[model samples]
Target: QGQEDEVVLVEGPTLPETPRLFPLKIRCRADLVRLPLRMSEPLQSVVDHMATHLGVSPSRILLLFGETELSPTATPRTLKLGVADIIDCVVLTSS
Candidate 1:
């Protein structure tokens, strides 16, 4: 057997225009549930992308209140997500 190599590639900045608010799923399996955890990587990427695109720092971006919490044991739980002032992607800068 020859050398087996494994490589990981990280794709940058492919966030949807609208922010989604839904219970976390594990591996796309509807039955699978995960503990309430924050997906910070994507959030960070979105913030950073917006920051750079708008000529601002990531720290300047503030996330207004529109967050929801889900329970791991809840079944048939659906969260609402739409394009609006409170749930869509936003970019801001401080003067």
Candidate 2:
């Protein structure tokens, strides 16, 4: 009886995990790229990832949605971004 009681005490309910995948489309210079992202990830990470895939420096890449320029610290959920939503990526040049 003591062993059974101890086993019951050691077990508890587990918390539900959050969703981990966010699909997004990025358009840049006639190139369209699709990527899977995490909602908790920072926007800067996404920028860096895209830059790598496009063979451009992170500093030379800019991301925009509609008429707004997204900040590096923005997250998918915070920005209310949805799957398949197209974001524009602009390549920057130093004068």
Candidate 3:
């Protein structure tokens, strides 16, 4: 080979210096969490953990509560995604 080259593509958001979670997968996996939600868990944390369970491949997350759908904003707990709320953490991981 005359010359070797490597390039980094600019895609997605930048990760924080601290540990951040970007769980990835690909399959249809949903979740129903009834709580008694955790106090310290923020929206990001919740999503991260949810995706974490999905996998590290390619997963689509479907966060819903019965007929209600979770908005991008608001924490799960504050959004009333807790007890009595059936969160459908439907994830579509790769086949």
Candidate 4:
């Protein structure tokens, strides 16, 4: 005789999958640059990438979201950033 298989159920909600590398947009002056980044990656990587792409120095680049300035050592998850989020990059001038 053929019998039906038993189904097993687990308790509690399933955990979300770990975030993978995603494309993020950075607005530097009038230019928009897209780069692939992971939430766990250091934010300084983004600044360095931007500096290389824009032909600027890392010291002259600053990243911002709204009015809050982001530290280069901060990760995307720490900043509560999502995929395709627009980050503003401003150039610093010595007075």
- Winner by lDDT: 4
Q: Which digits, one per residue and each the tens of the lDDT, describe model 1 over residues 1-95?
A: 89543333575555454333443333211222222323322334434544565576776644332454222222222332222222223444556
lDDT scores of the candidates, listed in order: 0.36, 0.73, 0.46, 0.77
Least lDDT summed over 10 consecutive residues: which range in candidate 1? 26-35
Encode model 2's per-residue lDDT on 12-81: one tens digit a residue. 5563654467677778678777777877777787688778977988777778988988865788778776
Which predicted model would earn the best TM-score? 4
Which window of 10 residues has the lowest lDDT sum in candidate 4?
4-13
Give residue 6's error in model 1 in angstroms: 13
Which candidate, 3 or 4, has the higher lDDT? Answer: 4
Model 3 ranges off by over 4 Å:
1-41, 56-59, 92-95
- Tens-digit per-residue lDDT, 1-95, candidate 4: 99643333565455464446787778877877878888888778788988887798877778899898887788888888765677888878724
Off by over 4 Å in 4: 1-19
- Give the distance in Å from residue 51's predicted Cα in candidate 4 to where it truly belongs: 0.6
| Model 2 lDDT, full chain set | 0.73
TM-score of each prediction: 0.30, 0.67, 0.42, 0.70
How does residue 31 of candidate 4 score in lDDT?
75
lDDT of 3 by residue, 1-65 (tens): 57543233666456443332222221225334332334334445445556666663223555566
Position 79, candidate 4: lDDT = 86
**TM-score between model 2 and native:** 0.67
